[PDB]
Design a protein around this nucleic acid. Structure first.
Lengths: 231, 213
DNA sequence: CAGTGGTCTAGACCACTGG
DNA sequence: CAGTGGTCTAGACCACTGG
């Protein structure tokens, strides 16, 4: 039971997206069942087929619908989410309360390797946090960021990056590698020395196709498994 | 320079997509230098604005270009992979993959295994290969299929080598290994292969790319 | 067959951007 | 200001599925 206002400042395709999205969650529409036609939709609202099509085409492009030559447009088979996740979002996803304990900060310059994150010789933020879940330490996170891409700040946080620049967030590159806990890794995380940890190098790009952050993290092997989902 | 076949059975946006893709890889077009206007493209080829826009839109959707309201459409710099087997994963690393079978079986279905995919307690293939890279042991892989493309689910977990694990791979016992459970589903929405692998920590790092908005 | 998505056209106004 | 992507319209032919 759908409603579209051509007069609204909110684009018509978006109105059609946002509402259908809920008609699916609410299961008012059922998977492996066709929707009204592109042409039928276009009439019911008194808009152009292509304007129907832009919303539908976006939803299919997001996996919520699918198409069959000569038959129609169909709703889909539900999904789960994790791409592009931070620790806080990774935890809320596992039903846990994310936490943060700052343990180190510095401003240091740069070897050639730090320059490899698309250096703009420059001054860098180096925040070393301890990541927690239900107040249990889960990981140690060393985050690397330039002043040529963030300047300075007093944080009290993802959006600052897209805010300080033209560009939004896009794609990310994670490198995982297994290790045994060093005595300081072990100490902080509260595990035995030599205990299995997971070393994650996450470098993150703008839609610029430019990276802003390179993060070396250490994750406890006992309480954390990396879950991933591709294609 | 760029060429459009309006009569051809391959659509015009796809023609535009494909060529542009190479002008970007080849660097004929430069990152952070804008493309010709949407309107400029439409004239230069003598086609409609919107069908140019379908090509670009698709490319921007693939991470290869980005748009700036009021300014234009710009290129992005980064490199390519995606969708992994052991063997494509190695070729990607400049290496020649190999396989040595060390076990094969058909066993009953236990419920935990059975919970993935359908019915169980039903005939399951269990192939255990030792995976090779330029003739080095890299992993020990126990792959599971019932005998009865799309999405994949990988779970990584770090560990220390058990003594037989160490044995095969030719590494010290207790050495850092990487435990990967790779479940892959068909377009059916039904699971196809469940693989429990063990990877040496010394010579292997897991690499992975993410998208979202 | 009448219906459907996939593609395509030749125009239109808007909000936004930079100089 | 003039240019750009963002949106929209009212038509069109096609190749394809089903009864």
């Amino acid at each position: 039971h759908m409603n579209i206002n051509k007069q609204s400042p909110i684009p018509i395709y978006y109105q059609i997206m946002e509402q259908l999205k809920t008609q699916i969650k609410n299961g008012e529409l059922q998977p492996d069942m066709p929707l009204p036609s592109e042409r039928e939709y276009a009439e019911q609202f008194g808009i152009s087929r292509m304007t129907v099509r832009q919303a539908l085409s976006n939803l299919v492009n997001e996996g919520l619908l699918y198409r069959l030559k000569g038959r129609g447009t169909f709703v889909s088979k539900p999904k789960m989410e994790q791409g592009l996740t931070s620790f806080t979002e990774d935890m809320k996803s596992r039903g846990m309360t994310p936490g943060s304990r700052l343990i180190d900060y510095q401003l240091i310059d740069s070897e050639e390797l730090a320059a490899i994150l698309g250096c703009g010789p420059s001054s860098i933020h180096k925040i070393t946090r301890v990541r927690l879940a239900n107040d249990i330490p889960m990981a140690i996170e060393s985050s690397h960021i330039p002043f040529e891409l963030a300047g300075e700040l007093n944080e009290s946080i993802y959006d600052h990056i897209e805010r300080y620049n033209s560009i939004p967030i896009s794609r990310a590159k994670q490198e995982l590698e297994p290790s045994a806990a060093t005595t300081e890794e072990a100490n902080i995380l509260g595990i035995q020395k030599g205990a299995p940890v997971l070393l994650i190098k996450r470098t993150t790009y703008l839609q610029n196709g430019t990276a802003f952050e390179h993060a070396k993290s250490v994750y406890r092997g006992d309480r954390y498994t990396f879950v991933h989902y591709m294609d």
